[PDB]
A paper describes a structure:
The S. cerevisiae Rpd3S complex has five subunits (Rpd3, Sin3, Rco1, Eaf3, and Ume1) but its subunit stoichiometry and how the complex engages nucleosomes to achieve substrate specificity remains elusive. Rpd3S deacetylates histones H3 and H4 to prevent cryptic transcription initiation events from within gene bodies because an accumulation of histone acetylation can lead to the destabilization of transcribed nucleosomes, ultimately resulting in the loss of nucleosomes from the gene body. Rpd3S is directed to actively transcribed genes by binding of the Rpd3S subunit Eaf3 to nucleosomes via an association of the Eaf3 chromodomain (CHD) with methylated H3K366,12.
Here we provide the cryogenic electron microscopy (cryo-EM) structure of the complete Rpd3S complex bound to a nucleosome at an overall resolution of 2.8 Å. The core module positions the Rpd3 histone deacetylase subunit centrally and positions it above the N-terminal tail of H4.
Numbering used by the authors:
A (entry chain a), B (entry chain e): 35 to 135
C (entry chain b): 22 to 102
D (entry chain f): 25 to 102
E (entry chain g): 14 to 118
F (entry chain c): 16 to 118
G (entry chain H): -1 to 3
H (entry chain h): 29 to 121
I (entry chain d): 28 to 122
Amino acid sequence: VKKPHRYRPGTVALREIRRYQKSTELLIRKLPFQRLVREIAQDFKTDLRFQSSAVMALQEASEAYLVALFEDTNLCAIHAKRVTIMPKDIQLARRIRGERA
Amino acid sequence: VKKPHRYRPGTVALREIRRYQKSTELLIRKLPFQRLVREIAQDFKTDLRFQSSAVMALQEASEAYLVALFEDTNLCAIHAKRVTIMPKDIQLARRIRGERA
Amino acid sequence: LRDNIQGITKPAIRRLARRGGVKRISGLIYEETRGVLKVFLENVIRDAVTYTEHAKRKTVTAMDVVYALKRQGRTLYGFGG
Amino acid sequence: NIQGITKPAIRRLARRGGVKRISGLIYEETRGVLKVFLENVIRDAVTYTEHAKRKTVTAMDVVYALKRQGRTLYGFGG
Amino acid sequence: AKTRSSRAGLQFPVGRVHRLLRKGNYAERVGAGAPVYLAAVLEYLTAEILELAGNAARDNKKTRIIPRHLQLAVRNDEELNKLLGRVTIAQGGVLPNIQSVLLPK
Amino acid sequence: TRSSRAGLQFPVGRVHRLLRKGNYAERVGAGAPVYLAAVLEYLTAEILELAGNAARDNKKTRIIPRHLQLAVRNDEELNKLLGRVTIAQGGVLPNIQSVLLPK
Amino acid sequence: XXRXX
Amino acid sequence: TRKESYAIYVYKVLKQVHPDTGISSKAMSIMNSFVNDVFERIAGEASRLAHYNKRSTITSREIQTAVRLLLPGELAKHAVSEGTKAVTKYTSA
Amino acid sequence: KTRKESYAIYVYKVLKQVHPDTGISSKAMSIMNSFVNDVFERIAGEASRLAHYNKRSTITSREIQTAVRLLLPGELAKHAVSEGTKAVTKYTSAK
């Protein structure tokens, strides 16, 4: 007899888009990314140490690359008359960029 | 009564794709491209001379670039569930490549 | 260290997509993004560790990462260099 | 002169690129793209020839210009 | 005036630029005017970026330029964004833009 | 010579001269030219092995640019190395997308 | 695949 | 020890452009990295130009051509004008 | 008549090593020479950058090895490193 205030799907998504394009703080949590970086590095040399600045630089580079990739992915998804990005969109973006063979 | 052997549309297109992916000769006529190169250059410097090898190198680079662009354009068109390449396909390919802003 | 790629949670990828201007995200996108991120990190950390080994150091410095990114064509400002 | 890049020539380039069906407007767009690419490459080549104080654009100037843009070309004394 | 920058009327170090050109393995010899020219170009580009960064900082009612303002300055300028097309600015963020089709009707 | 002293076909002397005159560093070590010449010879040997294979597949005894392009692009690692390189008179690999083929 | 020498 | 940087010079340029505007440490580092990057680009292109022409010296002409190649249109024009004016002032003094 | 240098003879020797009964065309030889020059420049430039980063004034075989490991992909880098080390050891053996 009242109904809660549910925003129509796609509204909070746009609000989040605005919020996260307005800000600059890193979006990936720091500890999980550091653990991932160390695990990946473990396959090239054992008993490696990382300067905190090194992990931060890796995180910034990775986040910037992923954001640019998602921009290209959204462009491809819109090109297909879609609104949802799908793995095929990421694959096409990477293929055109020249990253994926 | 009589009837021509018209190939179903899209068959000679495949034959031409096979023929032109199997060869290596340049697909743009030499003289028109040379005239185009000279006209573009005359904007930057007047009374310019071109080594024949210089124009040939320009043609090779241009044709290779256009062929790669058309490959990406074809991929973009197929991504859109189409078979025809259309200018929006070229625009998306260039935008993802980073060529066009 | 095991199964840390899943540390890049679904909401983190959602935030990254939102910063990229994405409104609707397919469910399969998260695993694909994790794979792409793993490939990128592997390509970068390989060169970073190569630089570290050449310097005969056991510590990967931020300047090694910066050199690796610059080598790959992703120059990064704000960490020296 | 840019129209010297004929419709059949762009068709051949598209075919070598694996394109089966080509829209009508693709030809003008391709002419524009080729014009932009040639403008960049020839501008760099002419810069190189001017710096060398030459009135002739040599294949080496073109090769260096392409190498600048990340389009290294082999087969012309690179 | 003693400093070479003062002779060239620059704020950037002509002497330091000359030393780097020499200890950079760029060529056997380095002309006398090359450091001056390079210092002038670097000064011009730095001023060009800082003008737009300061404008962006003012738009945010901020006295100090932070990496976000540098990112806005670079990306909102066509030529500068083309110069730094393949550059990541830490803490830069992205230019706010949303594709038209994603907006409500 | 120094190539014979290292068992190489490529010129260690010429490579040393090019390293010194190329303005790469103040001094060039003694083993640097040998190492670099060995790497260059190895890469040319790999490219030529694949190109001669392609020429044989084409029933030709002389390698032309087309064979070099085929060898480079078919091989994953060489193609990755020469990713941003265009080989004059190389053409492209025959490749047609599946959806474009007739049903 | 893997190379010979 | 001494870690050299462009902090002071960039600060002088800033105060000459926006006298009432400061710069944060992170922005300072980014600007210093940018100056180093552009220095490397221009110097490398000038080195390549000298090598191509069988020339052993990097003159102001090489730097000018490297700037014309590296920078886009309007930026290249203005940078060339600034460089030539600075070189002329230096030669006069 | 100017004396222009090239890698033609060494490329031909390597070819006769790998494919004894196979020639090469002038255009293909030019492409191979360009490829050798390009790889030389890439490796030498990366080695120079490595030496500069480490505040070292000499390009040693170690710098070349690390440059090769950076530039070439996995298996190609492995085999190139193997050949380089083999050549260096064989060289230092003889005098």
